[PDB]
Amino acid sequence: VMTDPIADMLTAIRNANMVRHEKLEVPASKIKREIAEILKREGFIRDYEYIEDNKQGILRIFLKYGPNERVITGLKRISKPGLRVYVKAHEVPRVLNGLGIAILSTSQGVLTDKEARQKGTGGEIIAYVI
Amino acid sequence: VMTDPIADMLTAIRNANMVRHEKLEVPASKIKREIAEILKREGFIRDYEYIEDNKQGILRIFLKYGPNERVITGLKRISKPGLRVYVKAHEVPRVLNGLGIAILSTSQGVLTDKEARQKGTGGEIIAYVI
Numbered sequence: 648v649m650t651d652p653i654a655d656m657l658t659a660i661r662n663a664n665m666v667r668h669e670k671l672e673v674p675a676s677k678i679k680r681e682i683a684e685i686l687k688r689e690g691f692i693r694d695y696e697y698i699e700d701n702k703q704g705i706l707r708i709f710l711k712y713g714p715n716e717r718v719i720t721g722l723k724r725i726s727k728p729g730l731r732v733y734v735k736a737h738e739v740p741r742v743l744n745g746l747g748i749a750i751l752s753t754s755q756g757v758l759t760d761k762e763a764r765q766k767g768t769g770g771e772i773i774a775y776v777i
Numbered sequence: 778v779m780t781d782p783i784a785d786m787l788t789a790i791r792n793a794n795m796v797r798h799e800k801l802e803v804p805a806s807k808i809k810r811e812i813a814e815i816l817k818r819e820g821f822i823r824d825y826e827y828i829e830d831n832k833q834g835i836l837r838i839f840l841k842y843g844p845n846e847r848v849i850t851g852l853k854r855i856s857k858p859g860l861r862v863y864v865k866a867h868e869v870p871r872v873l874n875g876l877g878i879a880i881l882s883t884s885q886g887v888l889t890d891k892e893a894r895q896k897g898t899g900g901e902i903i904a905y906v907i
Contacts, residue, residue, distance in 0.1 A: 736866035736897035767866035767899050 648678050648752045650773055654724040664719050668710060675704035681757035689748055691719050691776055726771045735769040747777030778808055778882040780903055784854035793840060794849050805834035811887035819878055821849050821906055852906040866899040877907030
């Protein structure tokens, strides 16, 4: 993978969350879709859908707000050019409940720190969400 | 892997260590030879050799003693029927220096706890030596 397009997606979600948008759109890709599935699965966004516009693939993300407040507190792109963050299977962080989610790019795909541990794999930490 | 023949090999080493014999011989096997290598590599035994006697593979193990004192303090078979000890890659023990070595059967072969961590694998803990 490459974290630049990932930084782009995260920046857009960040910005949309600030001004409280109900949705946002970003060019689709497999990894971006894998990230959206995780955010959705972990209750950070409400939903997402793949859409095509002028034959261009797009991911439409629906943000989630509790009774007026933002559900996403922060999103950060981690491993990046010049500052790679790789972790062996044994070193995948055990992230406490309530402290967020680490997203790893692994040989078995994009997984959360919790999935990586159950699957017994390490990988590149590409993002953190809280 | 089957642990009984491992128990049997470790028992013979323990007995020979108690009365302070220079060496012992046990029927050879892949796993048994793998344990011998690790024991030799980790400084617990002096050396070992494979020979075929009357068309039967034999592992001759040479014990090590400091100026008369024992080098092996304890060695036992761990995972066994009714007491299986399995560890995921993330939970492979971090054995401090001076506390011994855990030996596990992994999909990548018989490895010490340190090698399993380095290789990104979990497994069944078959023996422990201190």
